[PDB]
Write a protein that holds these residues in place. Structure first.
Motif, PDB file in Angstrom:
ATOM      1  N   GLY A   1       0.853  -1.173   0.000  1.00 16.81           N
ATOM      2  CA  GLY A   1       0.000   0.000   0.000  1.00 16.81           C
ATOM      3  C   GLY A   1       0.891   1.224   0.000  1.00 16.81           C
ATOM      4  N   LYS A   2       0.448   2.285   0.666  1.00 19.39           N
ATOM      5  CA  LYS A   2       1.210   3.525   0.759  1.00 19.39           C
ATOM      6  C   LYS A   2       2.588   3.254   1.373  1.00 19.39           C
ATOM      7  CE  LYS A   2       0.522   8.259   2.549  1.00 19.39           C
ATOM      8  NZ  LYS A   2      -0.461   9.083   3.328  1.00 19.39           N
ATOM      9  N   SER A   3       3.619   3.915   0.857  1.00 20.30           N
ATOM     10  CA  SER A   3       4.968   3.731   1.390  1.00 20.30           C
ATOM     11  C   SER A   3       5.347   4.942   2.242  1.00 20.30           C
ATOM     12  CB  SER A   3       5.974   3.571   0.245  1.00 20.30           C
ATOM     13  OG  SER A   3       5.655   2.449  -0.559  1.00 20.30           O
TER      14      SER A   3
ATOM     15  N   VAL B   1       1.241   5.669   8.357  1.00 17.75           N
ATOM     16  CA  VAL B   1       1.162   4.967   7.082  1.00 17.75           C
ATOM     17  C   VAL B   1       0.999   3.477   7.367  1.00 17.75           C
ATOM     18  CG1 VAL B   1       2.341   4.402   4.938  1.00 17.75           C
ATOM     19  CG2 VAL B   1       2.595   6.684   5.942  1.00 17.75           C
ATOM     20  N   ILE B   2       1.834   2.950   8.256  1.00 16.66           N
ATOM     21  CA  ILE B   2       1.758   1.540   8.624  1.00 16.66           C
ATOM     22  C   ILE B   2       0.354   1.228   9.147  1.00 16.66           C
ATOM     23  CG2 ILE B   2       2.637  -0.261  10.127  1.00 16.66           C
ATOM     24  CD1 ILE B   2       5.244   1.365  10.355  1.00 16.66           C
ATOM     25  N   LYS B   3      -0.145   2.075  10.039  1.00 17.59           N
ATOM     26  CA  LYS B   3      -1.475   1.873  10.603  1.00 17.59           C
ATOM     27  C   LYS B   3      -2.539   1.801   9.513  1.00 17.59           C
ATOM     28  CE  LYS B   3      -4.788   3.841  13.896  1.00 17.59           C
ATOM     29  NZ  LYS B   3      -5.002   4.897  14.926  1.00 17.59           N
ATOM     30  N   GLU B   4      -2.544   2.783   8.615  1.00 17.32           N
ATOM     31  CA  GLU B   4      -3.521   2.815   7.538  1.00 17.32           C
ATOM     32  C   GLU B   4      -3.443   1.590   6.626  1.00 17.32           C
ATOM     33  OE1 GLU B   4      -4.353   6.491   5.026  1.00 17.32           O
ATOM     34  OE2 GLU B   4      -3.590   5.140   3.470  1.00 17.32           O
ATOM     35  N   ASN B   5      -2.234   1.190   6.234  1.00 17.79           N
ATOM     36  CA  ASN B   5      -2.084   0.022   5.360  1.00 17.79           C
ATOM     37  C   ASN B   5      -2.530  -1.262   6.042  1.00 17.79           C
ATOM     38  OD1 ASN B   5      -1.028   1.317   3.052  1.00 17.79           O
ATOM     39  ND2 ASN B   5       1.081   1.124   3.794  1.00 17.79           N
TER      40      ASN B   5
ATOM     41  N   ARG C   1      -6.000  -2.137   6.166  1.00 11.52           N
ATOM     42  CA  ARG C   1      -6.471  -2.618   4.867  1.00 11.52           C
ATOM     43  C   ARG C   1      -5.854  -3.977   4.509  1.00 11.52           C
ATOM     44  NH1 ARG C   1      -6.838   0.518  -0.006  1.00 11.52           N
ATOM     45  NH2 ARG C   1      -4.797   1.584   0.085  1.00 11.52           N
ATOM     46  N   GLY C   2      -4.954  -4.457   5.392  1.00 16.11           N
ATOM     47  CA  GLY C   2      -4.318  -5.746   5.142  1.00 16.11           C
ATOM     48  C   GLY C   2      -3.203  -5.641   4.093  1.00 16.11           C
ATOM     49  N   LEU C   3      -2.733  -4.429   3.828  1.00 11.80           N
ATOM     50  CA  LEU C   3      -1.678  -4.207   2.839  1.00 11.80           C
ATOM     51  C   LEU C   3      -0.293  -4.133   3.483  1.00 11.80           C
ATOM     52  CD1 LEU C   3      -3.530  -1.449   0.777  1.00 11.80           C
ATOM     53  CD2 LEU C   3      -3.333  -3.901   0.264  1.00 11.80           C
ATOM     54  N   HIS C   4       0.747  -4.439   2.706  1.00 13.00           N
ATOM     55  CA  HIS C   4       2.120  -4.388   3.209  1.00 13.00           C
ATOM     56  C   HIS C   4       2.624  -2.947   3.177  1.00 13.00           C
ATOM     57  CE1 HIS C   4       1.733  -8.609   2.583  1.00 13.00           C
ATOM     58  NE2 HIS C   4       2.088  -8.623   1.312  1.00 13.00           N
ATOM     59  N   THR C   5       3.524  -2.607   4.096  1.00 10.97           N
ATOM     60  CA  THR C   5       4.077  -1.254   4.135  1.00 10.97           C
ATOM     61  C   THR C   5       5.581  -1.238   3.897  1.00 10.97           C
ATOM     62  OG1 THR C   5       2.406  -0.467   5.730  1.00 10.97           O
ATOM     63  CG2 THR C   5       4.389   0.861   5.468  1.00 10.97           C
ATOM     64  N   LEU C   6       5.995  -0.581   2.819  1.00  6.00           N
ATOM     65  CA  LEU C   6       7.409  -0.462   2.497  1.00  6.00           C
ATOM     66  C   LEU C   6       7.945   0.774   3.207  1.00  6.00           C
ATOM     67  CD1 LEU C   6      10.039  -0.954   1.043  1.00  6.00           C
ATOM     68  CD2 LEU C   6       9.132   0.293  -0.919  1.00  6.00           C
ATOM     69  N   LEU C   7       9.015   0.602   3.968  1.00  2.00           N
ATOM     70  CA  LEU C   7       9.596   1.725   4.677  1.00  2.00           C
ATOM     71  C   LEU C   7      11.002   2.047   4.199  1.00  2.00           C
ATOM     72  CD1 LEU C   7       8.505   0.742   8.283  1.00  2.00           C
ATOM     73  CD2 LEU C   7       7.567   2.623   6.929  1.00  2.00           C
ATOM     74  N   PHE C   8      11.142   3.132   3.449  1.00  3.13           N
ATOM     75  CA  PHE C   8      12.466   3.556   3.006  1.00  3.13           C
ATOM     76  C   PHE C   8      13.126   4.035   4.299  1.00  3.13           C
ATOM     77  CE2 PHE C   8       9.713   4.524  -0.704  1.00  3.13           C
ATOM     78  CZ  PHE C   8      10.365   3.773  -1.677  1.00  3.13           C
ATOM     79  N   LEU C   9      14.436   3.864   4.414  1.00  2.00           N
ATOM     80  CA  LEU C   9      15.125   4.298   5.616  1.00  2.00           C
ATOM     81  C   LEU C   9      15.995   5.511   5.292  1.00  2.00           C
ATOM     82  CD1 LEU C   9      15.961   0.890   7.256  1.00  2.00           C
ATOM     83  CD2 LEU C   9      13.850   2.201   7.230  1.00  2.00           C
TER      84      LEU C   9
END
Ligand SMILES: Nc1ncnc2c1ncn2[C@@H]1O[C@H](CSCC[C@H](N)C(=O)O)[C@@H](O)[C@H]1O
Ligand code: NA
Lengths: 265, 265
Positions: free
Chosen positions: A131-133, A151-155, A158-166
């Motif tokens: 989902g949203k990153s 972002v993590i919470k929102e995804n 919805r059961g979507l994965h969250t990509l986190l750029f560092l």
């Protein structure tokens, strides 16, 4: 009188596409930036040797503030290339530079290269399920960024994965580790108390994608927060609801606890 | 004893990375599959000549059903390359193949290449704003899929962009055009009546990403529905609310109407 935005890829100088290499080789002037990401398997010298051109490295301010004063003037009378780690338009604001190019009367073309956004497929998590990153930014003094937590919470809802750029502070050679990312998230959890990121949260870590042996690990925060994932760069992933086939890959390939195979239906 | 999953990239034979080309050249056997997707800007013949070794093509059945009987046995005593369009493992099914390699005692490595997921960055839309992705498939017989409509709705509702892959008949080299996708969506809207995709919806079409001259167009459905976007493949994107810079990029680079600068921002 053309400007080429050319991606260099994920890890080393050979991650550039043949198309990218052959065009860069024939350019009159070659510029580059190495602050948006880290290519851990190569050096400026090796990249220069490969393309056979001297490269002028620009700082973030050189680009954001003076791109039209340092690069565009030359691109009006010659073929100029602007190289960047990964794909030049992913997780950067370089797309905006194409607008500056146009208004300057300069033609620009984009040559893609492997990107972390796409390389996440090696984790076994379905790419369409992301989902949203977001980006986990280093706190600067008392300023403490926290938007990525939402972002993590929102995804996840919805059961979507969250990509986190560092985060990365290239000028200081500061490369945020997945461990540092986890620590920050737990602190944010303490503040917001939303039950989004905890010791029991399942996370995935991908380190040095692009190399032959990237570090691919999945498990609970409590267990991975202090694990050594090797040299940067790292990305952190908080999966949403897993498909059995994703869990199987994480277990078989990323050494995840076999217990995740039993999803809660 | 090694199997290499090598991405071919976006459009033509030069879209493979230097690393991928070099590794493929050193492999004793080279396989490729053109059923998950196609390399619209080149041919098997051109890819083969570039590599310099005969390439054996694998059908969907050969892979999904007999990968361990056709590919893995050879990987036991030789270096084997498995070429796929785009970036390896992005196709939801190929990750499983790494588990098969493991169970056969065969080491596997992934050599990345550009993917549509990262390449869409050329539309000027921030990749962090992309939500769940989906595929628009042709209705057939008693099956009329519409889930992609809900994906768009949930994303736009949260201000996120929706990347839509369009149906394809790989073996027949037949692709669904953006025009057809839009027509289908308008019909699903008529049934759903959720106000998710109408004549006034702003959409982005990306054609032939990877090419130096891809078609990048943005505009309202009522105006693009009958526009000639060139040869496939086409990628359809339904953007969510836009950042002013995204909108400016669309206007300046994709010929979007000035109207989006006030209506969709
Ligand atoms: N090879 C790699 N392995 C793991 N993470 C990577 C990576 N390359 C980039 N990243 C991640 O992404 C951040 C840069 S953000 C911009 C990424 C780049 N344009 C690309 O297309 O890949 C890094 O700080 C890191 O968190
Ligand atoms: Na995505």
């Amino acid at each position: 009188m053309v400007l080429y935005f050319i991606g260099l890829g994920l890890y080393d100088e050979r991650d550039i596409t043949v198309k990218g290499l052959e065009i860069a080789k024939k350019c009159d002037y070659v510029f580059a930036e190495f602050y948006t990401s880290l290519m851990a398997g190569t050096t400026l010298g090796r990249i220069q040797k490969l393309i056979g051109k001297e490269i002028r490295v620009l700082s973030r301010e050189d680009v954001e503030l003076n791109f039209e004063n340092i690069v565009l003037p030359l691109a009006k009378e010659n073929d100029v290339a602007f190289l960047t780690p990964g794909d030049p338009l992913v997780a950067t604001t370089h797309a905006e530079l194409r607008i500056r190019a146009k208004r300057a009367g300069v033609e620009s073309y984009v040559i893609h290269a492997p990107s972390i956004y796409s390389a996440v497929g090696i984790t076994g998590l379905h790419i369409y399920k992301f989902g949203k990153s977001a980006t986990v930014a280093y706190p600067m003094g008392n300023w403490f960024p926290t938007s990525y937590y939402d972002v993590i919470k929102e995804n996840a809802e919805r059961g979507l994965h969250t990509l986190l750029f560092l985060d990365i502070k290239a000028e200081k050679r500061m490369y945020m580790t997945a461990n540092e990312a986890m620590e920050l998230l737990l602190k944010v959890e303490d503040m917001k108390k939303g039950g989004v990121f905890t010791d029991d949260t399942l996370v995935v870590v991908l380190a040095r994608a692009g190399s032959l042996n990237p570090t691919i690990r999945a498990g609970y925060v409590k267990d991975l927060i202090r694990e050594d994932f090797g040299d940067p760069p790292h990305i952190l992933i908080v999966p949403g609801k897993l498909h059995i086939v994703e869990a199987e890959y994480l277990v078989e390939i990323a050494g995840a606890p076999r217990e995740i195979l039993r999803v809660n239906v």
